[PDB]
Amino acid sequence: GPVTYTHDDAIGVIRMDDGKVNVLGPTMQQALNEAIDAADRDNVGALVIAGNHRVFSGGFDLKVLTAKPAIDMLRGGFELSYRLLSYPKPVVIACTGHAIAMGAFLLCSGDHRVAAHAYNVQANEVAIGMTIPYAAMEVLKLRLTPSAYQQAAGLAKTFFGETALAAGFIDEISLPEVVLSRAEEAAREFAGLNQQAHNATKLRARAEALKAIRAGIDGIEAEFG
Amino acid sequence: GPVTYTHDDAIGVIRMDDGKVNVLGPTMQQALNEAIDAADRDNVGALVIAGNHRVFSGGFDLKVLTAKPAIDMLRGGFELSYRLLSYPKPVVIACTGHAIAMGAFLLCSGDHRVAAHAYNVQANEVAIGMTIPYAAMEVLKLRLTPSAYQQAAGLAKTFFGETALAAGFIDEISLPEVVLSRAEEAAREFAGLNQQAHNATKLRARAEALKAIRAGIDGIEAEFG
Amino acid sequence: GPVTYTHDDAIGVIRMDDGKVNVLGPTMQQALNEAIDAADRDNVGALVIAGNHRVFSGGFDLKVLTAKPAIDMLRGGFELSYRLLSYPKPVVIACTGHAIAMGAFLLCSGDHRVAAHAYNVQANEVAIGMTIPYAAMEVLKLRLTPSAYQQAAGLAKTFFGETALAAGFIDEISLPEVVLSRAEEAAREFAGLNQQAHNATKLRARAEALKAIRAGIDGIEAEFG
Ligand SMILES: [Cl-]
Ligand SMILES: [Cl-]
Ligand SMILES: [Cl-]
Ligand SMILES: [K+]
Ligand SMILES: [K+]
Ligand SMILES: [K+]
């Protein structure tokens, strides 16, 4: 399958690799959800989500998006963001290559985000004639600076490295060969925080956003129906 | 008149030059509105707003501000911000010199803002004994970082170059001799985005702010009446 | 006592030094409140709050926090933040060493915040098993970038120098030997702003946050009761 789950002492590691660009279609979404179910079963201290050697994720499966299967894929994508944003343990994203559209929203759904200098991060929807869904806007608004939010969304601006960090698309820049190892190291460090206080505090930090993402998930049919 | 409009293939270019500091009094406001009407008529792909060689704009005509003519000038200034923030095409600001008070709010009313390193950007109201209007606060809050918003507003802090960029007062720094040419280049690039998706997305990115600016415009009489 | 107040022409200067780490227990809180009362009596043009040579403040007195005395200390700490955030004159923080937990929230309660490169600023609550109070979250949210807010709160991230400045924990970096002198200089400069416009504008910039801090103060018993 397109997802590999490993349980490594204090952490769970989930690696996406569909042999292509890790599109978040129904197959990948199911595989991710099952992997997180496995982490839940193991009661991991922290969880790493990684891409493959060429990308984090290129986004949704656009063949599907281009009514019901498209709606289900959209809902499932944003439900995954919600699941990771409300995860009771720290979540670290190993952004192992570019993160585009739903890949960028997924990247913005973890607590700590590690990327290499060259990796592009872009909500390219407007450049290809798609309006950004309300749930995705809320995910962006939660992390981007006010001015980077405007440009990322309305102008499909591409960020990388220092601009991605300043914008709020990522939290740490690492050399490409250590993005995954550094994400795993960070996750081990974060598993040392008090879990109860971490979860209580992250939810306070995200209360309005999580409500609005839920509303955005509920309203998908009223946009792509 | 103080405004020149030119239609250049995919873009409209509006250049302010009253031979002084481009104060946004009733004459300039009418001239700007008529120029945007002309862009609307031409159905331009993107719109550039530029200052003159010495300033973007020094702000309102303070002789007028220092009840009804002052109220009308205030309302018209913030209505222009609203018009540009809700413009259905990309708007690029060529910040060709300093942008002070209403000039800064106008600067913050476009999608992409280009300035040179040396150009000061400042809401100087508090330094000269004026409370910042509610509509202007909303314009600032939409673009500035949380901490830069506090300082810009409450302390009349002056920004330029790297500090203006980090703060969220501008989006791009160019050499002074290419601010206008770079703004026009960017506008041509943005005219290539899908217009419908751009507009739908920018409005989602600005929904609350636009409502609050409207409320701030409506409440002007209750402050300067 | 642990607080020294001096009145120096246009400014008041309040210096914390309990001979240790300036914990914000009931004794320090009372001493701070009495010092601000003295500044109010003098109608100072601006107010400086400083730590000692080793710290700004290490936070609350954790012996007390580890029900009623803990509730009173919590309420009083956040009431001090509210008092400084709504102060009608400019408030400058001389962050003379590290600022941890309530020390960081106090640091975030002034208009202009000066620190040296090496000084750590951290809400360490989650690292030591404490959930961050709602009033403290609102203080952080008012100043930190969206992404720095998430990390500061949920991951107990430590900031200093350029990262503290970019994050929105401080506004100015000075050499350690001039943090206090620079804070006093800045306060003199800010006393030159129009007081009435400063206060009217800062309150507009803080309206929602101040309401939410008040709600957070009121709800303390429902969390530590
Ligand atoms: Cl939607
Ligand atoms: Cl007003
Ligand atoms: Cl609380
Ligand atoms: K999308
Ligand atoms: K004004
Ligand atoms: K606390």
UniProtKB/TrEMBL annotation, chains A, B, C:
Molecular function (GO) terms for this protein are: lyase activity
Q: Name one GO biological process term.
A: fatty acid beta-oxidation
Record has Lipid metabolism as a keyword:
yes
SUPFAM superfamilies recorded: ClpP/crotonase
Keywords carried by this UniProt record: Lipid metabolism, Lyase
Per the record, the similarity remark reads: Belongs to the enoyl-CoA hydratase/isomerase family.
Q: Which PANTHER family match?
A: (7AS)-7A-METHYL-1,5-DIOXO-2,3,5,6,7,7A-HEXAHYDRO-1H-INDENE-CARBOXYL-COA HYDROLASE, ENOYL-COA HYDRATASE-RELATED
Question: What's the protein name?
Answer: Enoyl-CoA hydratase, EchA3
